[PDB]
Amino acid sequence: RTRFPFFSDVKGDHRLVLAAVETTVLVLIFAVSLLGNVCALVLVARRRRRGATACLVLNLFCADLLFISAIPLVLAVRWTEAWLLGPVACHLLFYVMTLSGSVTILTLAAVSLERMVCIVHLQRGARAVLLALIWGYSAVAALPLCVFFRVVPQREISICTLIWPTIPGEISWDVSFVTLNFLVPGLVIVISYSKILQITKASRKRLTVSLAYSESHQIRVSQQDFRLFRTLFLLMVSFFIMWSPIIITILLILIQNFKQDLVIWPSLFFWVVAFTFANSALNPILYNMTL
Amino acid sequence: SELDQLRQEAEQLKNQIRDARKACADATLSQITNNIDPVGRIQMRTRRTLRGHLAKIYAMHWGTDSRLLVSASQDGKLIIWDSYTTNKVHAIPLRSSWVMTCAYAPSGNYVACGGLDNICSIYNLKTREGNVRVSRELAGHTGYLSCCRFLDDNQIVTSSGDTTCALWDIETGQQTTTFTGHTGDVMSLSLAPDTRLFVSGACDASAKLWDVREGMCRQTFTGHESDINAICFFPNGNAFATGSDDATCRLFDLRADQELMTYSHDNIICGITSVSFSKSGRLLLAGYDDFNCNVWDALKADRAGVLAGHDNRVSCLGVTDDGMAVATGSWDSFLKIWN
Amino acid sequence: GCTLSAEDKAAVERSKMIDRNLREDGEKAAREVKLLLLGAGESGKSTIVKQMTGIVETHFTFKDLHFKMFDVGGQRSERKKWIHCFEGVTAIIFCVALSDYDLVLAEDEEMNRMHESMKLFDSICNNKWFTDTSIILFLNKKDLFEEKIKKSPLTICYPEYAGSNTYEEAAAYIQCQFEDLNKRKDTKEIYTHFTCATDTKNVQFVFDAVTDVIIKNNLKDCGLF
Amino acid sequence: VQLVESGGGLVQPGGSRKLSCSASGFAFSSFGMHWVRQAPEKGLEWVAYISSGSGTIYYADTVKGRFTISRDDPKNTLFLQMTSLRSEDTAMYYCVRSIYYYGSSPFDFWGQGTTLTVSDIVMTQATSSVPVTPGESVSISCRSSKSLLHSNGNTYLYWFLQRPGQSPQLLIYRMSNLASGVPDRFSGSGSGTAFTLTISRLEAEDVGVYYCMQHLEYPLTFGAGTKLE
Amino acid sequence: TASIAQARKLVEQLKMEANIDRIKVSKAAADLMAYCEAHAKEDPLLTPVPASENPFR
Ligand SMILES: CCCCCCCCC[C@H](O)CCCCCCCC(=O)O
Hey, where are the domains in chain A? Predict the structure, then answer.
């Protein structure tokens, strides 16, 4: 009966200065992400003279655009206490946000798997059936997030909350959504980058036995094995530090069903989401390094 | 003493040659053709793009019907193109992926190719078995074969990297005539419209006009400061078009025996890979290492157009015998039919 | 597609079949490793090609990897006019002779032919086409150098050398002198190896060095490097 | 170049029969192949066609759905499977070579023949038989339903010649060209729907039946056949 | 040994090159100008003729 609001603040703590700080944070995030992602998109499009994973990255650069284009709606809502927007926006805003999130995670995992298989099965010396399939899983898996949003006054304020006719699947959907959109992708990335590192260090230890390295040349390679391991580590932990928080708050929202407590603060959910929108500005940096 | 006396005699004879050339000059080409109307602006659009090569494209040649094309690439492929419909009439796998020249017979029955194996192979296009097969391999050169050109019928002239050119006999397979007199690698050949005289340009910054029947050089033109990569005839067969590595084109002449025009620009530091004229002899199209082609206006010096559709070095040019198109090949494995 | 005659439809079908054949043959040729083999006079290229008229291509296979070695030693012409043909090969196999510090050129008895070999190495590793191609330097005839160094000091070739004339460190000095000619230490790497006349690990070393080259090229194009 | 074909013989109606043609002397894998049958009434009419890539198969709109045509490149053999043989399907069958690119001869070489007995634009010839005189030239006329001149400039009219006891031989393709090995006495002209073929000096080997054909669109239709004796 | 023969051959080639008649450069310039003026109407690249006769449009 006590539905949990999503994007709504009582604003009983501060006189709209919190609204000002949320607006400035969101507007700077939106501006930086728009500019950076469009610049990365155009420069990566510019060098399409060869191949080398220049297709799956554009998918990611577009998904971050969907995030940052869905941002202004919540930016506006934070000013209005209730869900004053048309009762069709809630059927669409959260759906597009979840779709963009799931495709960003899946394209990260697919880029990592492509890189690993390229390195392992030597390239020199399948994609449009994959882009469609990852865009296809997300739309069918995020579908229960567009039909189960009923705008109901909670008090009298409309809250655009989520409810489930099937109380049975409230646990089954989230468990399947977290496991196959945050667990599978993470393990794939981890094993792919671990295999890449293993291959690189197995190749190197085979030459040093064969005396292919002199002095003052064995201290430039150690300046380049460390630099590789410090790039394959920034990729493997930015995934688990930016997409981990959003996943965590979904579980606590579910477990709030049986907790019957105040485990989630009134403004906690918005801040976690505001953190995740930063990840749409980080991706045109990590996956466009050394350019 | 005799060697020094002979060297002094050669030097004084060269001085006499220079004096004779300077005496036969009245006014340069920039003075007589000053009052003619300018060409203005020449714009061309890429009508067709011929895809299918998977390596750098080193040579091309137009058919005498001005519709069929041949192109040679480093992936060991000689491809016959239908320019109008982009269709591939033939695909010939060379025995050697190192090919740097190709020619298409004026009668259309044969094609030729050569490269780093010092052998000019000839393929018969119109056979009774339906396939294209090697008719004759011409061997006898010691330096890389840099250019080949079919004569009127059943004869080919080839210029190689061993400072010697050779006129062959495809019926037998031996050098009918050997032309010597270059001190550097010969990189380009051109044939007169009457097909009795031809011109070879070499790395010695020289271009020699030979006689096919006699087999002995007639005239020698110098003036360039680096290697020569391109050579061509004017449509009336009485002028040159030399492209060098020092970013300059020059317009020589066979009767006046003296250079006439220099096509250069301060903004151009790259060499010239290919040079050709238009049908009327008014437009001189030159390939460049600046990833583009320049359309100069002969009888003048100002530029007339830029063909910048490529994203790599333009290696080969060609204007149809009809004069309706200008194909262009580059190292990005694309031909473009401009018009 | 609709205003084509029957003959033009058949012509377009023929063009498409030719395109398919070109694509298949071009996928076949991107799975072969091409190695431009260089050297100087009497460097040891002959024994290298044995233990493992223009260009002379050579084919061999080692552990499901096909190699092509494009020797251009017998072609005497300007390198400036055909060296860009090989822009795009995986690696360059440059062979020199260690026992060449006491011999001299037949044409001119000076510069001991080893500064002449270093001239070619400098000219080849500083090219404007080979700015991204690794090198596999083979120092040939190491067994004959051992006796040659015990009788004649290495300072004959190198006035500025200062060290004891033993093999284990004279070889290091000459290796360093050859490697110091590199001007781009980040883009390209030199994989030096000391080989004898009766050594059987040269093809294995070429295989290891070329897998390393390929892995680095892949990491470079993927963006990870 | 030789195409040898077999599989004929007396067959009862309602059965099945496979005609097999073996090619020896050319790259069979790059040639489209036809089948042209001729009843004893001296009428050539097209049957089927298979392209070079073993696709794009066509059939005449008289026997479609009953005959199948297939090719085998490793064995270089062309099969025609024939089912439900009717009483009107008795004829002599010829296998025809064909190649299509810019400037080829699509009906250059014909088969040898196979006698089989059972127990749309139209091309019309002028006459059925013409008196001959070696001194004067001989002109043969031919007309079509509509114009054969396509928008690309080609006029897809062919000309054949069947000598007694032999196979038809190509003489002129696209109404203005001449085949390989044919003497230059023959010439062809015409415009639109009416075409003509001129022979300068008629000889002993110039007698026989002359046939028209169009390749503008399928099905291919032949003429009645002018008999020069 | 063969160097003096090569020098003699070079001198002979220069001598035969020294017995070639030459016309003044004005005549050659006039001939080139007349040839370019005589073919100015039949050059598709020089004059952008309408697409009626163009086979690539
Ligand atoms: C990493 C996961 C996929 C990307 C998430 C994108 C970030 C913002 C969208 C969130 O999906 C929140 C939308 C409503 C809460 C749904 C779960 C509620 C329940 O059933 O407990």
Answer: 17-287
Residue nearest atom 11 of ligand 1, based on CA coordinates: A98
Q: How are strands ordered across the β-sheet holding B57-62?
A: B57-62, B68-73, B77-82, B88-93
Cα angle A165, A169, A174; round to 5: 125
Whether B118 and C19 lie within 8 Å, measured CB to CB: no
End-to-end CA distance of chain D: 30
Q: Check: CB of residue C215 under 8 Å from CB of residue A119.
A: yes
Experimental method: cryo-EM
For residue D72, give the 3-state DSSP assignment: strand
A36, A186, A190, C187, C212 from A232: Cα distances, Å: 22, 14, 10, 21, 18
Provide the CB-side half-sphere exposure for A87 (13 A, CA).
Answer: 12
| Residue whose C-alpha is closest to residue B83's, from B331, B320, B311 | B320
Total length of chain A: 291
Residues of D with CB under 8 A from a CB of B: 1, 25-27, 30-31, 99, 101-102, 180
Q: CA–CA separation, B233 vs D19, rounded Å? A: 60
Q: Identify residue B339 by its one-letter amino acid code.
A: N
B/C Cβ contact: 3+ pairs below 8 Å? yes
Residue C183, chain D, CB below 8 Å: the answer is: no
For residues A255, A256, A258, A260, the Cα torsion angle rounded to the nearest 10 degrees is 160
Give the list of residues 6+ apart from residue C109 with CB closer than 8 angstroms, or none: none
Closest CA to ligand 1's atom 18: A250
- Chain B residues with CB under 8 Å of C10 CB are none
Domain A17-287 has CATH 3.30.70.260: no
Ligand 1 pocket list (CB less than 6 A): A 94, 97-98, 101-102, 105, 145, 162, 174, 181-182, 243, 246-247, 250, 253-254, 273, 276
Please give the C-alpha separations between residue B5 and each of C162, E6, E11, in angstroms, as whole numbers: 52, 15, 11
Q: Give the right CATH number for E4-56 from 3.40.50.300, 3.40.50.1820, 3.30.565.10, 4.10.260.10.
A: 4.10.260.10
Kind of pairing between the strands at D157-162 and D208-214: antiparallel
- Domain residue ranges of chain E, discontinuous segments joined by +: 4-56
- Provide the annotated binding site of C for Mg(2+): 46
Range of the domain at B132: 1-338
Strand order in the sheet with D129-130: D129-130, D226-228, D208-214, D157-162, D169-173
Cα–Cα distance for residue pair D166/C169, rounded to 1 Å: 89
Q: Can you say which residues of C are annotated as belonging to the binding site for GTP? A: 42-47, 71-75, 140-143, 197
D181 token code pair: 């090995």
Q: Where are the alpha helices (DSSP H) in chain C?
A: 6-28, 45-51, 114-125, 142-151, 167-179, 202-222
- Neighbouring CB atoms inside 10 A of D147's CB total 13
What is the set of domains in chain C, with CATH numbers? 4-225 (3.40.50.300)
Q: Provide the token pair at D104.
A: 């080829």
**Side chain identity at residue D164, one-letter code:** P
B30, with CB counted inside 10 A (0-12, 13-18, 19+), is middle
Question: 């012509």: which residue's tokens?
Answer: C11
Interface membership of C9 toward D (CB under 8 Å): yes
Helix/strand/coil for A216? coil
Domain count, chain B: 1
In angstroms, the CA D95 to CA D1 distance is 13
A214 with C175: Cβ contact below 8 A: yes
Burial of residue C50, with CB atoms counted within 10 A of its CB: 0-12 exposed, 13-18 middle, 19 or more buried: exposed
Structure tokens at D192: 């639109």
d(CA B232, CA B239) in angstroms, rounded, equals 8
* Cβ atoms of C126 and C189 closer than 8 Å: no
Residue linked to tokens 């033009």: C8
